[PDB]
């Protein structure tokens, strides 16, 4: 009853580790398949109640991610225990970000980030902050039948795409910035995603969309 609610949080913790692994950070497959029991074994208090500030974690880029993107900085993933994120925990996490000096910071909120806290979202450039609702994270949408492989292209990969097809970026298919998968990849504006989907005319077809 209270027990069935903690399972959903565990499912979102999973989908977060999958999203971090996919974006290009060093996460193992063991950390992803963190089983059901071992979650409450680590993040539950004496009463068996999930303590969320324990769940936050840093993540570093993989070797080949730094080879493909040298400036892929380190990422920090803070969770909040209070179901309404006050502006006090925001400036705590925010000054945390520039203090430890990160590039990307992901904030998972339980129910509602106030209009006061979300004011400090673009307050630490050149670093970006993404805000994720907990319930939209229980299922990884990318595991769906209809969601094909999305791959973030490098600045040189995209420059080569535009050259080899004689294209201005206006002539490229577009992906919305608020698109679920673009949010999943932390897709920023102008970044081109390469979409590999299976086909029935050919075996496999490669399309590209650009952000906004």
């Amino acid at each position: 009853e209270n027990e069935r609610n903690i399972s959903r949080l565990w499912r979102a913790f999973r989908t977060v580790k999958e999203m971090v692994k996919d974006r290009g950070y060093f996460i193992t497959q063991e950390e992803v398949e963190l089983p059901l029991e071992d979650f409450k074994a680590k993040y539950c208090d004496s009463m068996g109640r999930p303590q969320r500030k324990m769940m936050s974690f840093q993540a570093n880029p993989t070797e080949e991610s730094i080879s493909k993107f040298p400036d892929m900085g380190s990422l920090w993933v803070e969770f909040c225990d209070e179901p309404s994120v006050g502006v006090k925990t925001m400036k705590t996490f925010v000054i945390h970000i520039q203090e430890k000096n990160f590039q990307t910071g992901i904030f998972v909120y339980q129910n509602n980030i106030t209009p006061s806290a979300m004011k400090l979202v673009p307050s630490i450039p050149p670093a970006t902050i993404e805000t994720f609702n907990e319930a939209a994270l229980v299922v990884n949408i990318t595991h769906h039948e209809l969601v094909p492989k999305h791959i973030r292209l490098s600045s040189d990969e995209k420059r080569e795409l535009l050259k080899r097809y004689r294209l201005k970026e206006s002539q490229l298919p577009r992906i919305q910035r608020a698109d679920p998968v673009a949010l999943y990849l932390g897709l920023k504006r102008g970044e081109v995603v390469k979409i590999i989907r299976k086909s029935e005319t050919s075996g496999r077809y490669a399309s590209y969309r650009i952000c906004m």
Partner: protein
């Protein structure tokens, strides 16, 4: 028409803009001061005041006094009118007001600065119109023109900005005036046009360029009219219906109105001007200038002519189907056209058109006089216009044109080289033939003229199907090309034989029809034998006959030929067809199937499946193998032998062909009897409350759903009872077997029973109170009351059956009529939305902006006409039968290549390196089996692909006389490396970089899986028995037909896709029960926000396919319910003792759940309804209690107490608080389930899935269907498969799963709309449409709100809808039109950059001397 020395060019760009008054006064050739059109003495002169004061001609005298040219030249010259006061341009009052709200008045300055943040980011919007929308949104509410602003460095000490002080007014539109208010009461002043003019004239150049305007082409100040251009007479011409009478145009009068009001305002200004008296003569001048451009203004009286009818505004001229754009530019009336009734002809070739002589004497082609034709043309001129092979006109180089009807010299014209002769249409002239409506490109096709008598166009009957032409009185159109190169465009692109195999359905679109199809079965019958006397006639009837009488199958007492034998004389050599119909063996005992070898029929009755528009039929094969022209001759030769034989065999159909033959009737009525007895049983059931409803369905709905199935399941039984009783001589059965006309239901309704009539799905409703007709007692649900027709058409309907059947027929006719406007308009929106899409010379599929829609057309780069459905032999069967077929183990004496199959057989046993090759071959075939089962999940193997390899190999087996005995001279290196080498020659793209080369392996992947699956070593050696000869030849043919199958850059894929979808939408005789094709397609194409059947298909977790209880648990887990669904009644009592109770049935359960309010709320719940949803009174009360927390003291009876009661009291003077708490409980609060989910049905879908052995097995699973969508919530439910869930609401799929998944669901839905009506449309058309709708990032509706708001050129967008408003914004924003859109070059009369215009043709001087 006359020669001009000016250089002739084509329009490259159209630069839109607005007229400055100065430029009008500049190009003005007259002042235009008097409304008098005429000399005022009516002396047939025109006054120096309005009509021709230097403006052009209305007479036959060298006029256009500026041009000295006279009409047919001097296109018209403009004058001006200086307006006495500025007036609005009616088309910009909306934008003027919008600009008025962005700028300060009395200070021409933008309200919001770069000192504002949201502004400086809206300022950076690269688009012009969208930036103006963001600026107007940010500025419509800043009302104070601020003069200083908090700086970027410190909000304390702020920064100045040279700002207006004054407050900005709140503006509102009243009629054609703009009124505003300021800032204890307000003040309202109307804004004078001159005030707005002076403020616009002071707007900074950066500010209005930020507002989307153009410093040189369209300043904002020019939306206000100061000097008004006067169009010349050719825009508003006169009329001469008598002599001393001339009717002036509506526009000339409306101008005279403007001029009258202007002179009134000018004298009132120049004189003593009473303020009110002149400030309403101005309102009248504004009214006339407004209604002169638009007289269809909203919320205003129309400007009415003397006769009451409104004056046609200029906007009215361009807008609408019959306006300027739609009815004069995108479509025209044309010369050199003809139309008459059509008829059929068994004796015309497929690509001929019969032209009556009277039309051939009228239509005329201009032939240039060359030494090759001067003799023939000179003879045609001698015959003149009265005999058929003659001519009408002769054009000399001078230009003046000789009329052979009248010219005195028509006898002795001696022609000269270079002269044109306009000769009559003669035999074999290519002409364009069309029947309307023209839905797909095959509705217009190029034929060969054959001049004939009798006033009717004559068609070959195999060409009826693409035109949708019958001979019940149709007319068809004929257009005669006039250039030597438009004839070439017809004969080399639009010719009928080229259009046989259509890209819409990758199958033929022409077949053997009607008489010839019915007769080719009777002729093909096994016991159909032809005598010698008749054989020789059938042979001489085939024109391409070789003169070799074939040896008769029967010699014996008398020589007899078979029907198959003689028909085979029409089948050319090199043709191989195999088709097993059903229980077909190679012995074909039922003469079933089809086996043609080298163009000779070996067995099988010939019918629709062989010679129709069938997928693998004879026509699709001959067309691919031998060519368009050989297949076109194949039609004529079959329609000549079969038609001749049928002419002498005869064929009829009588009323005896409907006789049910005695006892079969007796056994039919018995069948209807025991059916009318089953419904009377279920009636006494449902009348005694004994039947039980299935979930989510009324007891009554469940009842009628039963009864209907009982009835028309028995109609079909009597149907098959008569189909089986009908002998094989029954001529109707003969036509159903040949596939020429008729179907099962036809025999059923004509001979056995008609069946239940239906309206709107259900049976005949109670139009009267409780009965269908006054000849019936009330509450009569019997079959013969609700519209079951028990009698056959042979026996005859009763007045009741007759009237019910009439109701059902009217529903179909209404459906047709109500839907034709919809299908026709959907067709147009599709075409106009895809029109500018074609394949360019890099295989990318782009629109007129160069925007990529598809990187490779159809994701494979193939012409849909060069594609056949072949099977992928490497996806099914056991994992073992796979190994038995494909595995070769040179290191194993049981699994090696047998030495009988090839000559190096014994010396390769144990070859380790060769086994290394065959091992990597086998690992590639198993990699392919993996890939194929990932792509095609359900195991389907038959998929349309470019090269029919089965025929390409049967050809080799025949061409090379391959015996299944001798061993092949192939080596495993030959096969393995020959195929590995062949693949890198199957080329689509050709760039020299890893992007394009990867795109190549992508576009070629699936075909190569088929190739390796069919050219595997053991297959080539043990099944095909190929030779290094035949094998090398198969490889060269595969490479050839592959390269032939790629699309040609220039294919107007867009229109093809639109027509390929819209035309099946026409044939949809429509309508879990979900919204059907034509309405659902209207839903999809419009991006319908609130669709009609928002179902949701939820698959459950993998390890729960058969767990029915798990499915029941998820049903209860998601299916919504409220307290109302289980509440019988609620009552309010005065029970003021919280410890006692007045209602004695509540005496118990009161000391059991052992200050408050004395007022009791008492609910009674339904035991049955609680049990449908699993009761648990504790859950209900616990939810109510946790719904109100401390405020509401709640107790309830236990889960099996006889009556189910919940008592409720408030806790620490109105008592209507409880009255509102009641419906708060009944309506608001929920019990369990997801919001917006209503019904939830469990259906057990079939599902193919691979056995552990390998082969696919039916392993059905329980699935929940749904009424209502909440994807984000149902998704996160435990126990379901969150990666197989699907919704027909793709708008939701796009919002939860992304744009890509939305594209996939959008295709899945359009595909379901076509497939639900049995139709097949190839992937790439539906795919291309879905890609257009998704390429901009979201769901772009095929709608004047979606695609027509793109950045395509203004002329293209205005050719759809919202024409004049689009041209107005184009003028204000100074749009530039590339003229890359096809619609632009159509408007401009230029060769469009499509097809034969996708390139230029250059002459090369150096090759011009190499050849001489």
């Amino acid at each position: 028409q006359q020669y001009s020395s000016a250089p002739l060019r084509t329009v490259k760009e159209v630069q839109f803009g607005l007229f400055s008054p100065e430029e009008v006064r500049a190009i003005s050739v007259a002042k235009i001061r008097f409304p008098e059109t005429m000399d005022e003495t009516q002396t047939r002169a025109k006054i120096g005041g309005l009509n021709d004061p230097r403006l052009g001609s209305i007479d036959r005298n060298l006029k256009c006094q500026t041009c000295q040219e006279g009409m047919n030249e001097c296109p018209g010259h403009f004058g001006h009118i200086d307006l006495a006061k500025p007036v609005f341009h009616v088309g910009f009052i909306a934008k003027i007001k919008k600009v008025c709200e962005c700028v300060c008045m009395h200070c021409g300055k933008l309200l919001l600065d770069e000192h504002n943040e949201l502004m400086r980011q809206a300022l950076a919007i690269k688009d012009s119109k969208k930036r103006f929308a963001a600026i107007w949104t940010l500025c419509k509410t800043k009302m104070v023109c601020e003069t200083d602003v908090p700086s970027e460095d410190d909000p304390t000490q702020l920064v100045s900005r040279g700002g207006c002080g004054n407050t900005q007014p709140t503006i509102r539109k009243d009629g054609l005036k703009l009124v505003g208010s300021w800032k204890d009461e307000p003040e309202l002043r109307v804004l004078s046009t001159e005030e707005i003019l002076n403020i616009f004239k002071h707007i900074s150049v950066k500010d209005f360029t930020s507002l989307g305007f153009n410093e040189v082409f369209s300043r904002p100040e020019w939306m206000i009219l100061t000097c008004l251009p006067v169009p010349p007479p050719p825009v508003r011409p006169s009329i001469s219906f008598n002599e001393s009478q001339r009717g002036e145009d509506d526009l000339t009068f409306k101008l005279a109105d403007i001029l009258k009001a202007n002179i009134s305002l000018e004298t009132l200004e120049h004189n003593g001007a009473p303020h009110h008296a002149i400030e309403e003569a101005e309102s009248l001048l504004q009214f006339h200038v407004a209604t002169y451009m638009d007289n269809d203004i909203a919320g205003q009286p129309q400007a009415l002519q003397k006769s009451g009818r409104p004056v046609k505004s200029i906007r009215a001229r361009l807008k609408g189907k019959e306006g300027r754009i739609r009815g004069n530019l995108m479509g025209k009336r044309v010369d050199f056209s003809a139309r008459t009734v059509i008829s059929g002809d068994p004796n015309l070739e497929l690509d001929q058109v019969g032209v009556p002589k009277s039309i051939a004497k009228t239509l005329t082609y201009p032939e240039v006089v060359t030494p090759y034709n001067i003799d023939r043309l000179t003879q045609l001129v001698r015959n003149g216009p009265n005999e058929h092979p003659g001519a009408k006109y002769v054009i000399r180089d001078s230009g003046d044109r000789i009329d052979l009807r009248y010219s005195k010299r028509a006898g002795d014209i001696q022609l000269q080289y270079g002269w044109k002769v306009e000769r009559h249409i003669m035999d074999n002239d290519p002409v364009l033939f069309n029947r309307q409506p023209s839905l797909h490109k095959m509705s217009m096709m190029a034929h060969r003229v054959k001049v004939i008598p009798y006033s009717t166009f004559r068609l070959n009957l195999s060409v009826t199907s693409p035109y949708n032409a019958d001979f019940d009185g149709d007319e068809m159109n004929l257009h005669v090309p006039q250039s030597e190169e438009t004839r070439a465009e017809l004969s080399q692109l639009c010719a009928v034989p080229l259009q046989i195999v259509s890209p819409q359905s990758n199958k033929p679109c022409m077949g053997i029809v009607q008489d010839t199809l019915c007769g080719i079965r009777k002729l093909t019958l096994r016991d159909t034998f032809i005598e010698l006397d008749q054989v020789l006639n059938m042979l001489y009837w085939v024109p391409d006959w070789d003169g070799v009488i074939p040896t008769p199958a029967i010699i014996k007492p008398k020589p007899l030929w078979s029907g198959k034998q003689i028909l085979s004389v029409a089948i050319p050599n090199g043709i191989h067809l195999q088709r097993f119909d059903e229980g077909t063996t190679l012995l074909s005992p039922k003469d079933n199937g089809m086996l043609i070898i080298d163009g000779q029929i070996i067995f099988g009755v010939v019918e629709k499946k062989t010679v129709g528009s069938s997928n693998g039929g004879l026509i699709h094969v001959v067309t691919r193998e031998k060519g368009p022209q050989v297949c076109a001759k194949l039609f004529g030769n079959i329609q000549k032998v079969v038609n001749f034989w049928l002419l002498h065999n005869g064929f009829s159909t009588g009323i005896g062909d409907t006789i049910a033959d005695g006892p079969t009737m007796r056994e039919i009525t018995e069948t209807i009897a025991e059916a009318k007895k089953k419904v009377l049983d279920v009636t006494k059931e449902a009348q005694a409350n004994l039947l039980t409803a299935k979930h989510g369905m009324t007891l009554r709905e469940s009842f009628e759903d039963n009864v209907v199935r009982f009835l028309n399941e028995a109609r079909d039984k009597a149907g098959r009872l008569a189909e089986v009783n009908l002998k094989d001589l029954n001529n109707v059965k003969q036509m159903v077997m040949a596939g020429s006309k008729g179907s099962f239901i036809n025999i059923a309704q004509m001979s056995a029973c008609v069946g239940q009539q239906s309206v709107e799905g259900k049976r005949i409703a109670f139009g009267f109170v409780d009965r269908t007709l006054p000849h019936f007692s009330k509450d009569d649900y019997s079959p013969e009351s609700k519209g079951f027709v028990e009698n056959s058409y042979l026996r005859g309907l009763t007045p009741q059956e007759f009237f019910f059947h009439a109701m059902g027929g009217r529903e179909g006719l209404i459906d047709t009529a109500v839907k034709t406007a919809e299908t026709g308009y959907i067709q147009r929106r599709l075409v106009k939305a895809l029109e500018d899409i074609m394949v360019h010379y890099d295989n990318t599929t782009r629109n007129s902006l160069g925007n990529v829609i598809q990187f490779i057309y159809g994701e494979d780069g193939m012409d849909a006409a060069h594609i056949e459905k072949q099977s992928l032999d490497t996806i099914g069967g056991s994992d073992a039968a796979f190994e038995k077929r494909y595995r070769v183990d040179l290191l194993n004496t049981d699994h090696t290549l047998d030495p009988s199959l090839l000559e190096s057989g014994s010396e390769i046993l144990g070859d380790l390196k060769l086994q290394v090759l065959l091992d990597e071959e086998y690992k590639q075939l198993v990699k392919d089996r993996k890939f194929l089962r990932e792509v095609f999940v359900d195991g389907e193997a038959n998929w349309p692909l470019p090269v029919n390899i089965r025929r390409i190999i049967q050809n080799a087996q025949q061409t090379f006389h391959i015996d299944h005995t001798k061993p092949s001279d192939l080596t495993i290196k030959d096969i393995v490396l020959g195929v590995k080498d062949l693949q890198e020659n199957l080329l689509v793209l050709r760039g020299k970089n890893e992007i394009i080369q990867n795109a190549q392996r992508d576009a070629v992947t699936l075909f190569c899986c088929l190739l390796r699956s069919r050219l595997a070593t053991r297959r080539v050696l043990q099944e095909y028995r190929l030779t290094k000869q035949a094998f090398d030849w198969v490889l060269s043919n595969i490479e050839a037909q592959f390269l032939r199958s790629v699309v040609h850059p220039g294919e107007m894929v867009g229109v093809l896709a639109a027509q390929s979808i819209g035309e099946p939408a026409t044939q949809m005789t429509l309508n879990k029960k979900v919204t059907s094709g034509v309405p659902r397609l209207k839903e999809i194409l419009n991006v319908a926000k609130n669709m009609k059947t928002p179902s949701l298909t939820v698959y459950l977790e993998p390890g729960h396919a058969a767990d029915q209880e798990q499915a029941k648990l998820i049903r209860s887990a998601i299916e919504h319910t409220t307290l109302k669904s289980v509440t019988i009644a609620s009552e309010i009592y005065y029970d003021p003792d919280p410890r006692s109770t007045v209602i004695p049935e509540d005496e118990e359960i009161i000391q059991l759940h052992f200050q408050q309010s004395p007022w009791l709320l008492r609910l009674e719940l339904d035991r049955a309804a609680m049990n449908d949803k699993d009761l648990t009174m504790g859950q209900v009360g616990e939810r109510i209690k946790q719904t109100f927390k401390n405020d509401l003291f709640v107790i309830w009876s236990e889960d099996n107490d006889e009556k189910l009661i919940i008592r409720c009291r408030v806790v620490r003077e109105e008592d209507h608080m409880l009255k509102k708490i009641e419906n708060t409980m009944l309506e608001n609060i929920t019990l369990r389930g997801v919001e917006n989910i209503e019904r939830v049905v469990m259906m057990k879908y079939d599902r193919k899935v691979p056995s552990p052995t390998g082969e696919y097995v039916k392993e059905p699973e329980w699935v929940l269907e749904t009424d209502g969508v909440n994807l984000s919530e149902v998704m996160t439910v435990p126990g379901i498969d969150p990666t197989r869930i699907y919704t027909n609401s793709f708008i939701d799929i796009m919002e939860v799963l992304g744009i890509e998944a939305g594209r996939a669901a959008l295709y899945k839905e359009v595909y379901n709309v076509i497939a639900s009506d049995g139709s097949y449309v190839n992937y790439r058309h539906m795919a291309l449409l879905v890609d257009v709708m998704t390429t901009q990032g979201g769901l772009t509706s095929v709608t004047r709100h979606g695609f027509n708001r793109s950045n395509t050129g203004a002329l293209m967008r205005c050719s759809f809808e919202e024409t004049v408003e689009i041209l107005f914004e184009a003028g204000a924003s100074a749009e530039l039109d590339d003229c890359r859109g096809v619609s632009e070059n159509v408007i401009l009369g230029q060769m469009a950059p499509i097809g034969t215009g996708a390139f230029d043709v250059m002459i090369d001087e150096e090759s011009l001397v190499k050849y001489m």
